[PDB]
Design a protein around this ligand. Sequence first.
Ligand code: CLA
Ligand code: CLA
Ligand code: A1L1G
Ligand code: XAT
Ligand code: XAT
Lengths: 162, 177, 75, 185, 171
Amino acid sequence: LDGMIGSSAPFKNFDPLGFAAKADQKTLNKYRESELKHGRVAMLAVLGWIVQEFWHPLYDGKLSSNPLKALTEVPLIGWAQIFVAINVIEYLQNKIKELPGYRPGDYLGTWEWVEQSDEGWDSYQTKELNNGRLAMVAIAGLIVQDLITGQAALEQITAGNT
Amino acid sequence: ERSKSLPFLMKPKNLDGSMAGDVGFDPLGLSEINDVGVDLYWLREAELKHCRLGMMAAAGILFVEILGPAPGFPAGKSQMDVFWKVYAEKPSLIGASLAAIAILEVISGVATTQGRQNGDRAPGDYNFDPLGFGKDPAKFKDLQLKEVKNGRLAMIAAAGMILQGVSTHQGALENLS
Amino acid sequence: IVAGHMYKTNWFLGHSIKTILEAHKGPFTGEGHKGLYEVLTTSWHAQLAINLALFGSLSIIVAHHMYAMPPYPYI
Amino acid sequence: SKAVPFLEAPKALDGSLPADVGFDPLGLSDIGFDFTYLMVPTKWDESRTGLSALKWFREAEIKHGRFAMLAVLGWVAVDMGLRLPVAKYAGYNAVQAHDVFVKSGDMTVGLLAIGFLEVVMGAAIYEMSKGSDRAAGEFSFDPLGLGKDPSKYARYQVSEIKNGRLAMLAFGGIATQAVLTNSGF
Amino acid sequence: VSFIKPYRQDPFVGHLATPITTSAFTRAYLKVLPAYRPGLTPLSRGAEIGFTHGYFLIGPFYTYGPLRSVEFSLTSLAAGLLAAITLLLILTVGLSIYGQVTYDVYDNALIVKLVRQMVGSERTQDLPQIKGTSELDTVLGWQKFSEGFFSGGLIGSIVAAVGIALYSTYL
Ligand code: CLA
Ligand code: CLA
Ligand SMILES: C/C(C=C=C1C(C)(C)C[C@H](O)C[C@@]1(C)O)=C/C=C/C(C)=C/C=C/C=C(C)/C=C/C=C(/C=C/[C@@]12O[C@]1(C)C[C@@H](O)CC2(C)C)CO
Ligand SMILES: CC(/C=C/C=C(C)/C=C/[C@@]12O[C@]1(C)C[C@@H](O)CC2(C)C)=C\C=C\C=C(C)\C=C\C=C(C)\C=C\[C@@]12O[C@]1(C)C[C@@H](O)CC2(C)C
Ligand SMILES: CC(/C=C/C=C(C)/C=C/[C@@]12O[C@]1(C)C[C@@H](O)CC2(C)C)=C\C=C\C=C(C)\C=C\C=C(C)\C=C\[C@@]12O[C@]1(C)C[C@@H](O)CC2(C)C
């Protein structure tokens, strides 16, 4: 709800509940960090959901193609390694956050090269944000549908449980 | 400013009044093509060649179907299928006719391109007036108009006869009745 | 035949290779493909390089697809 | 506006077109796309200033109205008999005559002839886009001559567009109902 | 925007500021590594490097050595551990000789200033010159670095052997 990147045509500066009208710059940076992290994690989660459903080469097959079921089938020592890798990545991100000129979601340090941003750079950042938002909605829907129905995405669609 | 044939269309720029049969009927503006060696001269020469070929073909079909074939030639009343009967027994006639037409068409193309280049020959002109039917003017324009109209009608007729013979495998007047 | 109706030659129809190349810039590539059209229309050696490389690659691909899927009777 | 009073106007329905009352709730008469480019995909001519979507829509509406009027006349005719004085047209209603005649090689001939006429008059539309003074739907077709007296021409215009709208809706009903006033579902 | 620019506004260096050389991720990741982590003595840097290196070095020797075993064997583990320790010894010998022949300094970040201020009219290359101002760039610093590498390598190899034995036995 500022001159921040992420304002698109359907709803420009979409803050209907006024979360940003009262927040300071630090809280807004925190909000942008949370939104970008959620969007990236959700894009990965949606892609993994679908691909796992129609392709699970690892673990010598097995590891039932329905997600939320393979969640309880991974050896639980591979879960620990994924957890530790995510933790090390976020430790590195925390270290990045104290670098001078840091921008909320910018872990590549594009502020080093991008002074006086263009419209293409802002448009690409907005594209990433919008894809992340769509993936957040999609992954929430995926998890809820798999919980209530018990079938996965391409399985529920194939049968016709819509 | 509006074409005489199509009042809802502006006058085609390249068709003023000169050519016989000109009524401004160029809805697609094909007369303005000036590429791939195609222009108004080439289009008019092609139209006149088509007119003459269609006139000859329609006259031949009607003659053979009405008055019958010449002695020693096959019958059948289907002109699109009697060709293969002639070729089955007199292939040399067909081959010689094809070679003659090929040579005459090479000459025709050379003449068309030359007359287009050093403008001295009107499109479709081959100086073929052995009987002197079009020597004087004020009759040449009327004869050109008659030839163009008859040739367009015979073009349409000959295309119709070709399609009818290919599809129905019957004679033209056989399809008529 | 469809692919042959792509580039603008003599009518107001088709593409200009200069306009296509000059529009393909990027953050990592600076000016992008600007000037490549002038390079490939003023140097026979550049055209020979591209054509010979792709031609040899095509020959090797042909060699593979030949024995892989024999296209001739009793070959 | 003069219809749907709680909406002022689309933007381009000033009144320069006949049969104008201002009814356009969706604002379809403001699309910036020049639909002549659906015919000539490129600008082609340097003098092609462009054709407003409103004029293209008016031409399409007039053409639709004429088509629908002739169509309802034909569909009503084949419900009450009235077959062409020739063989192979016996009785096969209107819900089935279309397919049986598409089979018998003459609907293709009709398609070719209608396409020829459509191409000529679409060349007229393209010239209008180029900037000819010809108005939408004006093919200068007044053989019998009941088109003089400009007041009569304007009245006949509004009449033709209103009749075309009525005929469009009536044909939609007739084809949807499979006719009820002269035949059964 | 352009994501490649001359390094530090010098167009004549043989280097570029790409999204990999000078990215914030690269900065933080290289600044958390033992070789560049702030607040570490050279002995601590050497110890951490040796621990990590012995830890991942025992792996290939134990797994693919001349005395492998598809099951768990104490002899295979001992062979891999000894090979890793001897390789660490060879690396420590290399470090020692490299430091012996490279530097002649016992306290850096000062001698450079002393010869930039109090003049260096001597045989040079010890008073003047002096490449690098890190504590690793001294005779004392590199000696402690090698000592830490060697001790940490032994400890990390032993720890990794213990972990391998536990994983092969209790899993
Ligand atoms: C939130 C992300 C996420 C999570 C938690 C999982 C979780 C899981 N996946 Mg998976 N997957 C994901 C995304 C994810 N996936 C994506 C995006 C793809 C497309 C390439 C796949 C493709 C995939 C296949 C083909 C298979 C799994 C399988 C599995 C299961 C076993 C773990 C495994 O072998 O992973 C394997 C994961 C991969 C091969 C690809 C992971 C690539 C990661 C997500 C991208 C890089 C991450 C990086 C380290 C951190 C980002 C850096 C930066 C942005 C900060 C487990 C339930 C296996 C299974 O049993 O299926 C039922 C299996 O066979 N996944
Ligand atoms: C939208 C107009 C339209 C269309 C598509 C048809 C279609 C049809 N009618 Mg038909 N009809 C119409 C209007 C129409 N009619 C009108 C208005 C009347 C009353 C005058 C009739 C009276 C009528 C009778 C009496 C019969 C048919 C029949 C038929 C069918 C057989 C014809 C056929 O196979 O195609 C042939 C091809 C076409 C119909 C395409 C039309 C091409 C025209 C001829 C080109 C010229 C149009 C004209 C010049 C327009 C002038 C405007 C402008 C130039 C100024 C066919 C389904 C016959 C049948 O068996 O039906 C069950 C039948 O017996 N119709
Ligand atoms: C480069 C060139 C010439 C030239 C040049 C020059 C030389 C350089 C000089 C100038 O400077 C330029 C230029 C361009 O002019 C081109 C040559 C032309 C071509 C390419 C010739 C094409 C002729 C094809 C024809 C005319 C065939 C017609 C077929 C029929 C079939 C008849 C049937 O009876 C058959 C057989 C079976 C029956 O069941 C039924 C049917 C189907 C009706 C009707 O007849
Ligand atoms: C080309 C030709 C015939 C070609 C026929 C062909 C290809 C047919 C081939 C086929 O049928 C076969 C064979 C077998 C079938 O299974 C296959 C096909 C293909 C169907 C005849 C030319 C025939 C050519 C002829 C008759 C030429 C006559 C020339 C004369 C009279 C010249 C006179 C002059 O030369 C003088 C005397 C003095 C000069 O100064 C002035 C003039 C006037 C020029
Ligand atoms: C829906 C429709 C029109 C709807 C109009 C509406 C809602 C108008 C509403 C308003 O006016 C009111 C009420 C009041 C105004 O103040 C406000 C508005 C809003 C303006 C037309 C459908 C129109 C639908 C049509 C025309 C469908 C035609 C289908 C045909 C002709 C099929 C032909 C065949 O060929 C096949 C396909 C197969 C062959 O085998 C058989 C046959 C049958 C021959």
